[PDB]
From a paper:
We determined the structure (at 2.3 Å resolution) of the wild-type enzyme co-crystallized with 5 mM of both CMP and a disaccharide acceptor (α-Rha-(1→3)-β-GlcNAc-C8-methoxybenzamide, 2). Disaccharide density is clearly visible in both active sites, and after building refines with good occupancy (0.9/0.8 and 0.8/0.7 for Rha/GlcNAc in the A and B chains, respectively). The ADP values are similar to those of both the surrounding amino acids and to the Wilson B-factor, indicating that the ligand is well-ordered within its binding site. The acceptor binds to the opposite side of the pocket from Kdo, making interactions exclusively with residues from the N-terminal α/β domain. Glu158 was previously identified as a residue being absolutely required for the reaction, and makes a pair of close hydrogen bonds (both 2.6 Å) to the O3 and O4 hydroxyl groups of rhamnose. Other important hydrogen bonding interactions include O2 to the indole nitrogen of Trp20 and O4 to Arg12, as well as to a structural water molecule. The GlcNAc residue is stacked on Trp54, with the methyl of the acetyl group stacking on Trp20. The amide nitrogen of the GlcNAc points to the indole ring of Trp54, making a strong interaction with the π electrons. Both Trp20 and Trp54 are important for turnover, with Trp54Ala having a larger effect, consistent with its extensive van der Waals contacts with the GlcNAc acceptor residue. The methyl group of the acetyl moiety sits in a well-defined non-polar pocket, with van der Waals contacts with Trp20, Trp54, Leu64, and Ile159.
WbbB, a lipopolysaccharide O-antigen synthesis enzyme from Raoultella terrigena, contains an N-terminal glycosyltransferase domain with a highly modified architecture that adds a terminal β-Kdo (3-deoxy-d-manno-oct-2-ulosonic acid) residue to the O-antigen saccharide, with retention of stereochemistry. WbbB’s two C-terminal GT domains produce a polymer with a [4)-α-Rhap-(1→3)-β-GlcpNAc-(1→] repeat unit, while the N-terminal domain of the protein contains a GT99 retaining β-Kdo transferase, referred to here as WbbBGT99. Kdo addition blocks further polymerization while creating the epitope recognized by the carbohydrate-binding module of the cognate ABC transporter, allowing export prior to ligation to lipid A-core in the periplasm. The evidence presented above strongly argues that WbbBGT99 is a retaining glycosyltransferase that uses a double-displacement mechanism analogous to that used by retaining glycoside hydrolases.
Residue numbers in the entry:
A (entry chain A), B (entry chain A): 1 to 217, 220 to 381, 390 to 405
Amino acid sequence: GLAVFLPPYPFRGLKAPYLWMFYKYLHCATDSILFITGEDYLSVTDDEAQRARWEFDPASMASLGYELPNAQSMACHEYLTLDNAFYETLLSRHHHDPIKSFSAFLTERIPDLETELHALLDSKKGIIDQIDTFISICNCPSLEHVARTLGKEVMHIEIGPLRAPMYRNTAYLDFAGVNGGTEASARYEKCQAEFDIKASLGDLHNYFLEVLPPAEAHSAAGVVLQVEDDSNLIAYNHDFTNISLLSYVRQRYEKEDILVRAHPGSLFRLRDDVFTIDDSANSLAFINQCNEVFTINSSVGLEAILTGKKTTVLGDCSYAFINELAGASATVNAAAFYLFSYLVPFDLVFNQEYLKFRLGHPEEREIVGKHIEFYSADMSSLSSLINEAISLEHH
Amino acid sequence: GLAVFLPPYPFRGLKAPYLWMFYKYLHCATDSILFITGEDYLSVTDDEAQRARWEFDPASMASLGYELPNAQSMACHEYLTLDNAFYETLLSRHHHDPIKSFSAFLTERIPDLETELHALLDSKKGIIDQIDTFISICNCPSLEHVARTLGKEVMHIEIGPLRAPMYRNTAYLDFAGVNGGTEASARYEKCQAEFDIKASLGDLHNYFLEVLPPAEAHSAAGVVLQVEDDSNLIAYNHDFTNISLLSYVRQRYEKEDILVRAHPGSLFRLRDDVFTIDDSANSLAFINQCNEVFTINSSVGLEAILTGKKTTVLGDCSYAFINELAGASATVNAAAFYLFSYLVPFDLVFNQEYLKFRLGHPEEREIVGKHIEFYSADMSSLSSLINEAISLEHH
Ligand SMILES: CC(=O)N[C@@H]1[C@@H](O[C@@H]2O[C@@H](C)[C@H](O)[C@@H](O)[C@H]2O)[C@H](O)[C@@H](CO)O[C@H]1O
Ligand SMILES: CC(=O)N[C@@H]1[C@@H](O[C@@H]2O[C@@H](C)[C@H](O)[C@@H](O)[C@H]2O)[C@H](O)[C@@H](CO)O[C@H]1O
Ligand SMILES: CC(=O)N[C@@H]1[C@@H](O[C@@H]2O[C@@H](C)[C@H](O)[C@@H](O)[C@H]2O)[C@H](O)[C@@H](CO)O[C@H]1O
Ligand SMILES: CC(=O)N[C@@H]1[C@@H](O[C@@H]2O[C@@H](C)[C@H](O)[C@@H](O)[C@H]2O)[C@H](O)[C@@H](CO)O[C@H]1O
Ligand SMILES: Nc1ccn([C@@H]2O[C@H](COP(=O)(O)O)[C@@H](O)[C@H]2O)c(=O)n1
Ligand SMILES: Nc1ccn([C@@H]2O[C@H](COP(=O)(O)O)[C@@H](O)[C@H]2O)c(=O)n1
Ligand SMILES: COc1ccc(C(=O)NCCCCCCCCO)cc1
Ligand SMILES: COc1ccc(C(=O)NCCCCCCCCO)cc1
Ligand code: NA
Ligand code: NA
Ligand code: NA
Ligand code: NA
């Protein structure tokens, strides 16, 4: 079965931080799952003091495709709960900086957490044998060390950079790292010579578009801001922040030529009069107003690259290698590989059979074939598969 | 004469960043000054592309007490200008992160900058002999190393934590460091036994108040936010940011009990619905609504301490040592020493005679006497001097 790691540590100030993925795995479960999580994930549903969070919003349940679980649903799974007291110990070991504690969680081993993971997995005979893989929503060297000792793989799984409603929902599935330390570039490198994609970047973008474009845009410099305590801005950012990203652009452009777009999930917005503030209904309308795009490691950086905009990417992320190729032809091929083979149809990362498939580490051809089958469920070599999928969308 | 260091490096995206202090020294000059600055400080006045900045606002000129300079004014001083090309070199040595370059400027030696400072000071015979002290608006180990080689002191001088209109204007004057690495605590330690202040913290606060209080406030937890690229949040912050400060408070309080106040000089404000946002006309009205106050190293932390609020100070700053004393009596004495001896009447740090005075390193008694003379210009031991000054305000 699956061992899904959903840590309860409230680094950013919210209990059950990964509640949406908990709900999605529960909803899609074909088999009994092993959850390694916190007490808070089980009780949050009967806690009216936070019934207003976004995971209970019907639009959120519709866009992500889950239902709130019930006793029947939950009852057929096993739960290992981490203890809240080690959290306070960890905070006190980092000057009580919860965000610096997050960073350490994401990027360093925590021997005490290893030891508690080992005891939880040991607490019931047979648990370890039934584990076919770990699944983790974030990098976590504590868990990766435990997994090595036990001979288990760790799938790092997250929502992807293309998301509804603008796009088909995508997910990350990476055996090395999600967002930071990813294997997307290394998987492409072993395939770069087995590529001949007869489509432009626009076509790749069009394939995932679920909406009509805004179209027909100007502002020399677009600045993408991110959520300030996103793991992306905590560990994978090369020390850049929204404020230093903004200064970086001002080293290059006069204020009149800068268009700034705050992240809609952020607790902060821009002061209304100093730079021009973007008011677009979506990040695609925002980048269409822009000649150049500047980001640390936002999902929007990928959007800009696919629509052909000169993009500056200051942080580490899964898609950066596409931007670092020099040839236009290589850039198209890399983007196609990223979109059709690295990225996963969102629902499939919660599908047990699909996960078993990937655990066998099959050929790139097979992975692309499975993804296109999903994408096409209502409408050969690797190149041949993607060219036909695109062609079928064309008419 | 004075050698005033006003670096031109636009780390935060503005040319002539320290233009206000340039104007204030020019306005108050009784003698010819040596300015070590950038070309931009001289030409900014004839540049209409930024006539809208705050240093040209009449309210700003009135509150700080300077006039815009003219040819006569400027003409009797000497100017050493730093070259813009080393700036680009420095940025490229820090991954083109302007804020990380700022940090390095504030906290590490830059041999190439030492070498250029040495050449500028050498470029005209006699310059070095006429230097009685350096004045710097920020810590700068490049300049401190040069100063040691030449046998010159470095006065670190800044606007203080109490400012008009709420307060009499104050300034910092510190031979070791301003904001970070300060000597306020060490100066108090040599005097702690020569103290007997017969006033409360409220009286000390009242002495500097220039306004009627808002009065009569509740919200358990006040969170003071700062400007995101303030040197205080770049180098002296112990890695804390507004976002991690906010999370720190959420580890301790429910969202309902949190009152957040954004800095009015910030480019960012808070999202309108998640925490309660302070709308006070001034930081004093904001902290009066609060049972506890949380800051990294804002000037407001001092305000909270003087009004008796439980204050948490997560970063380094000049006033923190006051908060770390355990006795109420010691806390009062430390605050009195800080306010009357460490802090300086704003105008005096631009007064050449006063600076010559401090360069002689006189007794704490003498420093307090001079400050009270200034404060009293229109109305003994060290304790005796402050008790009488307070008493005279009383009636
Ligand atoms: C209406 C629709 O198709 N919505 C998408 C979700 O699909 C629905 O919910 C899942 C649970 C079913 O398996 C599908 O057959 C479908 O009925 C989907 O889960 C999410 C994620 O891609 O996207 C919605 O748009
Ligand atoms: C499904 C989704 O994208 N949700 C968004 C949130 O991101 C998810 O939840 C947090 C807990 C994780 O750290 C993210 O990595 C991701 O898995 C996001 O935090 C909020 C606010 O921007 O918006 C949701 O839509
Ligand atoms: C009106 C007033 O006193 N304003 C204060 C400033 O003082 C004035 O300007 C200076 C240049 C003169 O030397 C003073 O005699 C006075 O006329 C003062 O400079 C600033 C700073 O403390 O504060 C104003 O409130
Ligand atoms: C005189 C004053 O307090 N001005 C405020 C600005 O601070 C000063 O200017 C910058 C360039 C320095 O880095 C500060 O250390 C200080 O000397 C401040 O930046 C702006 C915005 O908050 O507000 C002015 O009033
Ligand atoms: N400045 C920003 C950043 C993100 N976004 C939206 O948020 C989603 C996730 O972006 P991040 O990866 O930047 O969190 C993007 O696909 C885009 O829809 C936005 O609309 N404006
Ligand atoms: N959150 C904040 C921070 C500062 N301030 C004001 O800004 C001035 C300087 O504060 P900092 O030292 O925090 O920059 C303070 O004296 C106070 O008047 C405010 O009004 N609200
Ligand atoms: C306040 O406005 C300003 C702000 C900064 C400058 C300034 O010195 N630029 C020089 C370096 C610019 C970096 C370009 C690197 C190119 C590789 O990408 C001028 C004016
Ligand atoms: C989402 O709400 C939350 C957020 C965090 C917690 C939580 O685990 N607190 C435990 C540590 C709190 C730190 C106090 C240290 C005391 C020294 O100052 C609970 C609920
Ligand atoms: Na499409
Ligand atoms: Na490229
Ligand atoms: Na007063
Ligand atoms: Na104290």
